[PDB]
Structure 1
Amino acid sequence: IEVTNINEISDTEIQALEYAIFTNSTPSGKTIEFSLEEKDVFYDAFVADSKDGVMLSDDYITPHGENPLKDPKPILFLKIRPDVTINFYFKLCTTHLYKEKVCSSKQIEEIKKQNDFSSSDYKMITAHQKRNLFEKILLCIGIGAKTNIGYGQLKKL
């Protein structure tokens, strides 16, 4: 609702959208006749630019065991430095939902051409809105390891 103009979305609509974005199918096992460009591709995120400084730094995690009377255990690992630009690459398309089902672009054109076309049952999320949705998710939870203890959180450049 935040990223797109859709006022109301149903649980089945959310399920269909998720299975179209990630599985590229229907919630079940059925295949939708999709075009070449109607596929969601998640490329590799690369380090883009370390402005003034290196991109790799060293950090410590020092577990203290169940016995506080015993010595700690310094663990040294390699991390990506803060203030480093990460480039996320996606190949996203426009998702067409009609009557809580995912439709192809030509399918949705044919549906639009029909007489009993209910505009209330038609929903569309574009590639830009998909990118905004993914950006919000990434800014919410982050990416990588030890995300619960803070590592891998991102800010807008």
Structure 2
Amino acid sequence: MPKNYTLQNASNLGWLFYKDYYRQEPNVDFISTQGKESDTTADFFRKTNQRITAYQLNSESPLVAAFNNHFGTPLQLKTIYPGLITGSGLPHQTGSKGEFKLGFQFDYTTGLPYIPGSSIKGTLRSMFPFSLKDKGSTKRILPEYRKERMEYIRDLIIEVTNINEISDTEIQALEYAIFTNSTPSGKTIEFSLEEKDVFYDAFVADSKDGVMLSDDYITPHGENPLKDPKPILFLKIRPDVTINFYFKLCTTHLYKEKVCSSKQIEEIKKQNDFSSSDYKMITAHQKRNLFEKILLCIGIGAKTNIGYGQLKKL
């Protein structure tokens, strides 16, 4: 109920948004057709919304400090005015008045709004050329998809690394090593324990002088310009909220358009055939900067084509 979301006194935001949202209070009707647009239902949902959108997150929160301890140094980014929407496809719609129509991604235990690591991984892989599966339904669009994403990823790799020129096959190998951790044919590479790219969850870390959740309106004006539009209400992460992106990245060694482990490159370097031109490496910091530039270019979440989920460097 108060501000300053803490483990001591704060309702679970996911619980409040999913289970306590639709509590069966006496004299509230959202099952019948008449009750859904009744004003009592609107007031009930409005009070629940007010409770949801009234919490703050201190920069020195013990929760985020524990996250930093467990998952390493964060990548701190902030949100631009439209906001950040994630998990919009989760079902949270009854057709009642004053209710949040779209779903929202909350952590089960903590309740803090978060971006699951799968969302981050998929958003990063989408800009990589070999994300679309060659399955037959995508035969037509695969070539142009691969070409444009290959060009963009080549620009980003050249900009962020010290590699002067990288090939399409090397781009394929790098993408498969980073995400699938294998060769493009599915063959496993003999990687060590710490040579794996882990995309942790992204957590809200700091809402400086305001709440971290807010309500926004999307109003689709109909095809008919004479009928009234239908407003849509949903929950967004507020502008100027610090999102912490946690990664566990490694160093990728490329030799002759192939991805090799640390030991394989250690043995290959000693051999009296080691071509320096045919050797490329991307450190963890360079990979993190590549991911950071991808995020700053395309953003993360839902409704991204209309400006939502756009991130800025802190």
Structure 1 length as normaliser, TM-score?
Answer: 0.99
Tell me the distance in 1 between the aligned counterparts of 2:222 and 2:176.
Answer: 43
- Helix, strand or coil: the match of 2:296? helix
- Helix, strand or coil: the match of 2:306? coil
Query: Which of the pair has more CA radius of gyration?
Result: 2
Gaps of 5+ in 2: 1-157
Post-superposition shift, 1:101?
A: 0.1
Post-superposition shift, 1:29?
A: 1.4
Post-superposition shift, 1:2?
A: 0.7
Task: Render the CA deviation track for 1:96-138: whole Å, top value 9, x for unaligned.
Answer: 0000000010000000010011010000000000000000000
Q: How many residues align?
A: 157
Higher relative contact order (CA 8 A, sep 6+): 2
Tell me the distance in 2 between the aligned counterparts of 1:22 and 1:15.
Answer: 11
Tell me the distance in 2 between the aligned counterparts of 1:22 and 1:123.
Answer: 18
- Helix, strand or coil: the match of 2:304? coil
Higher helix fraction (1 or 2) = 2
Post-superposition shift, 1:30?
A: 0.6
Gaps of 5+ in 1: none
Task: Render the CA deviation track for 1:33-72: whole Å, top value 9, x for unaligned.
Answer: 0000000000000001011110001100000111111110
Post-superposition shift, 1:15?
A: 0.3
Post-superposition shift, 1:153?
A: 0.2
Post-superposition shift, 1:4?
A: 0.6
Residue number in structure 1 paired with 2:208: 51
Identity %: 100
- Helix, strand or coil: the match of 2:166? coil
Report matched runs for 1:4-153 at 5 Å.
4-153=161-310
Task: Render the CA deviation track for 1:68-98: whole Å, top value 9, x for unaligned.
Answer: 1111001110000000000000000000000
Tell me the distance in 2 between the aligned counterparts of 1:145 and 1:29.
Answer: 31
Tell me the distance in 1 between the aligned counterparts of 2:261 and 2:296.
Answer: 30
Tell me the distance in 1 between the aligned counterparts of 2:169 and 2:271.
Answer: 24
Higher strand fraction (1 or 2) = 1
Tell me the distance in 2 between the aligned counterparts of 1:127 and 1:82.
Answer: 29
Tell me the distance in 2 between the aligned counterparts of 1:110 and 1:46.
Answer: 40
Task: Render the CA deviation track for 1:5-31: whole Å, top value 9, x for unaligned.
Answer: 000100000000000000000011111
